[PDB]
Amino acid sequence: ARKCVITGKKTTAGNNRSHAMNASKRTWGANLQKVRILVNGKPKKVYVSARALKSGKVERV
Amino acid sequence: FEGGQMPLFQRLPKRGFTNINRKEYAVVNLDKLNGFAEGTEVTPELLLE
Amino acid sequence: PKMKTHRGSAKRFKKTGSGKLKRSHAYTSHLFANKSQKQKRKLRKSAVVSAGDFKRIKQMLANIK
RNA sequence: GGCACAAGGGAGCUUGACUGCGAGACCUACAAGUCGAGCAGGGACGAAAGUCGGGCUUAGUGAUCCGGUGGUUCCGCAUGGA
RNA sequence: GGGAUACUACCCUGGCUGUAUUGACCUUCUAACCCGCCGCCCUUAUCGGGCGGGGAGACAGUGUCAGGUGGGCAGUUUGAC
RNA sequence: CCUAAGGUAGCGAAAUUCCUUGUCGGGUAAGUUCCGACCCGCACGAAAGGCGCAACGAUCUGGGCACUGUCUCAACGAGAGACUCGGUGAAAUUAUAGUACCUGUGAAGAUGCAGGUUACCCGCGACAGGACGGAAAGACCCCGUGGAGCUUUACUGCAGCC
RNA sequence: UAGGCCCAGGCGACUGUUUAGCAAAAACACAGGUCUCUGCGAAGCCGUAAGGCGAAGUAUAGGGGCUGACGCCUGCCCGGUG
RNA sequence: AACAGUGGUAGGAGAGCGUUCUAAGGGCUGUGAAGCCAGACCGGAAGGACUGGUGGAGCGCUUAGAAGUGAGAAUGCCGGUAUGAGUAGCGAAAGAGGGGUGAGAAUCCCCUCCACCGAAUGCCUAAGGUUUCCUGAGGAAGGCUCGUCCGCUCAGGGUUAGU
RNA sequence: GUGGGUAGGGGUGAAAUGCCAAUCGAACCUGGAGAUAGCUGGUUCUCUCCGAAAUAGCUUUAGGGCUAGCCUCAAGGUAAG
RNA sequence: AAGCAGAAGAUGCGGAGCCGCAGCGAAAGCGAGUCUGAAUAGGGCGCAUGAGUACGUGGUCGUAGACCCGAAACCAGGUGA
RNA sequence: GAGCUGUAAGCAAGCUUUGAUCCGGAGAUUUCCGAAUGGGGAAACCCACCACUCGUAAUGGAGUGGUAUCCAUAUCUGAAUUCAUAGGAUAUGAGAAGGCAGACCCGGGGAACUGAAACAUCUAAGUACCCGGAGGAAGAGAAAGCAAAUGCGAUUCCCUGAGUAGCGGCGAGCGAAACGGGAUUAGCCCAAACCAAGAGGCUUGCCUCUUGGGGUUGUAGGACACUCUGUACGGAGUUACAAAGGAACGAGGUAGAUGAAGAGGUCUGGAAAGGCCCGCCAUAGGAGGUAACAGCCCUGUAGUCAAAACUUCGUUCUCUCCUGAGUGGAUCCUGAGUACGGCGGAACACGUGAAAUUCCGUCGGAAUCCGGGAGGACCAUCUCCCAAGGCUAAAUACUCCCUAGUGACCGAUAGUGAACCAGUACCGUGAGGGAAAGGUGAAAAGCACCCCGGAAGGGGAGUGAAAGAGAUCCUGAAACCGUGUGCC
């Protein structure tokens, strides 16, 4: 799924709000990005959120 | 409800505010003190007991 | 469940010593050009809730001391 | 509906087209609406009595909520402010 | 003449160059990302993955935010005597 | 004068013409229909196509011939029901009913009320005038601050798209 | 057991299709005409996405709108809306 | 006691009857309880007794308490039974007679003739049914009549693959 | 004919809003759910005391509602009607 | 009251809390007064003219389906070619 | 401890004091389907491979065991590609899968009808529903807390605060918390500084990673220095604070045992448990049954006992584990893409509002002890705490089920849909919907025999208290259907 393998950031639900305050359901996506990282010490390319990449601890291969 | 005629409360304006720091005192009139005996020091602790 | 006070009324009325309700006058918000000073002096004072209305709404203020 | 001791016409000075009110009444389901002597403050006119809280009377207006503005010996979420 | 001329001290107007920043824009590049292109391997496999070329490339795609459009769809409104 | 421009060809009382059975001609003894013309096109018209058109049509429309019980105007015969007997045996409906006619009265249209008239008791085969007959809480109309489907330059939104 | 026929007109060219159970028709479809989108990961469509139809096709192809065989034709207006 | 009053819808107020259960007292009942069925009794009403018949083991009374407490109507729900009514209908069609069986025969069996289908109303074989198939026995129900008969009831039995 | 596929804010439609299990302008079943109904129908024993209204005002109000008027019970004033 | 002892009881304990005896004001606050007001004025609301509280029965009301029956519909999850 | 071979009659054949049937504990067996798992499949069926075994000359046939996928562990190989890695093979696994209790709990998604007398903000409601994770409970929890006192001292739940403060087309409505009274109580462990060891990058005297020690807090604590002290004398513990194991004993659960006192007399009666007259027992006058109502007839009850085996709890012992005080203020440590902020939402009773506090997506982005957070915008002062790591029992919620019981609960149209062969019959393609139906008698003593009849059904005779109790068999109302006739 569109869930960050490292931080777990995934889609979350909430409301959209019009000016008249009408509420309708919507989701917030994680900013997931295809990157090569170590998965069990074996470099696989998986989806990681930009935020998890921001640090730099998540090293690309 | 008044059938659609504007209800009384809605016709009238709201008034005032509530003070958070409002103090209420337990009042005692002089007639109440008369119940005690002479020379007694009437404190709130004595009154409450 | 407890009977719930009518909150709109609680903001508008006040119980007097003998249990009457004190209220403000209407027509005291604006358009004061269109009202004589006599009206304004009188509308400025408080009034009591009428007997007819009091019975209709007495229960709305039951929880209020 | 009233008005010719004018409420109609003219002239002098002025701002009562006042502030706090208000016994008691009319009208009225309520909300409102109407009249009011008299009291106090400080004034206009008048020599004084006295009259003046708009207009000869009765239409010319819109609740609450929510905002704007001015004033304020009110409140201010520990305290001083805000 | 309003003001005096040398020279020096400190400054302004205008323009120019350079140093260092600051964006905006222009091209170009390759390593991100993309390939519903080719070759090899996993592998008897028109999927997927790995490797090597090629193309494209800082765009696109996607996330967050914003504006416009939007009866495609949806909830409703559309007076009394 | 106005407009962006003012309808051309063709067709026209038409699946379109209200007035209207338009007027004229034909068809009939008699033709609001039909056919041929005319054109004052209420309110035709050129790809929501215009005007023609052989073939086709359980299409719509008018007229002839053949043919006939469609009709004048009904008659007879056959079979199946009906009818009688033996066997078997429902249903809708139903406030209780010993349930006439006339005029009137009445929530204004009576088997049931009033005043008259008429009527011995019980069935069978038939007809449908009434029981405002049965069936289906009227679909018409109006109302409800009822519903649903649809529309849009109604309001407020959402997807999609830029 | 086995077509009634003829004349004339309207509509649709035609065979075909349609409201199972009140409408078979002039309605739909149709071959033909035209407009428009689409350079291929095509446009369009289904799905949140992956994955698909389009298409194992490639502008003489594919999608969408309108018209509806054939014959003769299809005039004027780009101000408004797209 | 006197005087006066006493129609009534919506509605307000009062006093009661009755049903089920509980408590406490006091009883009834196999010498017959409750229920049911009669009757010509009693009370102002809701209602309550008494007697007899049926019934065959539970039930009143007094005071108080608690409620699933009172039905004639809701095109009410369920059950039972009526009316229509001995009425409609008995579901396309050729049967007749002679024997047999039997408690009983238009209807079952056999015989004869006749009649109908015969591009089917014949033969085979699907899907589907699932024992309906065969033999013997039966006539409660089912069979739109009847029934000795049946695709029904009761007993048995019956389906054989290297192709 | 057989075996399959498309499912309801959907499918399928040579298009009739047609068809999707005798149901279709939005299938059927269960649940929210005893939806809501200012509307219609129904609301069960008896007697006694008293006994209306069908009006005014306001109302997205008019066959609904609210206040007043008119009824009833209780307590006061009392004799004011 | 919860709670702790106790027969699923009565009861005992439990004084936190609740209502009333003081009201007036929007409030600071003052207090048989208080608010308005410049005011020992007038007026409003109060006091003098005082009874509340706990429990039970009954009437009515609020929130619950709320006296009973009745929609056409809406939504959610499924079942059907 | 004397009969038994179920309902369930019947016939048949048998078993049992050498102890059956029956009751309880623990084992064995347990076809096929089902997560179903060797493969397939239209569940309950079909077809295989590998070992071993039966059988045949052999094929064909049969029995037992193994053979799913994922995950974990070990081993062997290792592509494109050189080392490698991916991948593949083998072995080892009481690892996972699925179900449900229609409940309770924590989360992911999340309506509409309805209310507002319309309706969109709002309400209904974070409800119904779908999905995931679980546990016997779950969640929360040991202060960056509540407060404003000569303060309190984790969390949870009950009472109260209070329908208050507040929120709100300030409409309909929504609605706290703290203090106070109670139930229950319980606290702990890491990260970092530092020490020791070891290893790889040598980044080259530095660094990272890995082990053990150390250490856990706020008017600061710890490291680090100083002393004092223990090293088990003593303390704790498997419910947190480390983690398993074993005994002895006690009290229970899962069958049972024992257990007082009248056939008292007499009266009806089919039958006494009833009536009348007398007794007696009682730590037993609960209850059911017995031919009408039983403390003394039966099973029982009160009371006192009982377990080969399995199981629950408790207490001791064994066992296991374990140092904690004071003084320093040189330096060092005290949780970073974190806190927090903008933008978009959500949760807080609190609808963006003056909006503190908490959570999510996106982007930006601190201080770090001279530090940091909160006290409802925000600043200053003061007060109280020390976030960005984890664990933690009890009080609480719920009941499908087990045991024992209770009811001013129902008594066959009631009470569960279901008292009865009921989720059945029937209806539907399916999801699904969904009934009706209790009573002979005390005992079958269930009508021998005779008569009419083919039988059914009757009439006698018998049984019985009663057959007008004869199988839809207690009672037997009304509608409705008949027969006879007193009056018309």
Ligand SMILES: [K+]
């Ligand atoms: K719409």
Ligand SMILES: [K+]
């Ligand atoms: K007959």
Ligand SMILES: [K+]
């Ligand atoms: K008559």
Ligand SMILES: [K+]
């Ligand atoms: K009639």
Ligand SMILES: [K+]
């Ligand atoms: K008797």
Ligand SMILES: [K+]
């Ligand atoms: K399906």
Ligand SMILES: [K+]
């Ligand atoms: K009964």
Ligand SMILES: [Mg+2]
């Ligand atoms: Mg709505």
Ligand SMILES: [Mg+2]
């Ligand atoms: Mg109207």
Ligand SMILES: [Mg+2]
């Ligand atoms: Mg043109």
Ligand SMILES: [Mg+2]
């Ligand atoms: Mg046209």
Ligand SMILES: [Mg+2]
């Ligand atoms: Mg055109």
Ligand SMILES: [Mg+2]
């Ligand atoms: Mg045309």
Ligand SMILES: [Mg+2]
């Ligand atoms: Mg007849």
Ligand SMILES: [Mg+2]
């Ligand atoms: Mg008349």
Ligand SMILES: [Mg+2]
């Ligand atoms: Mg008449």
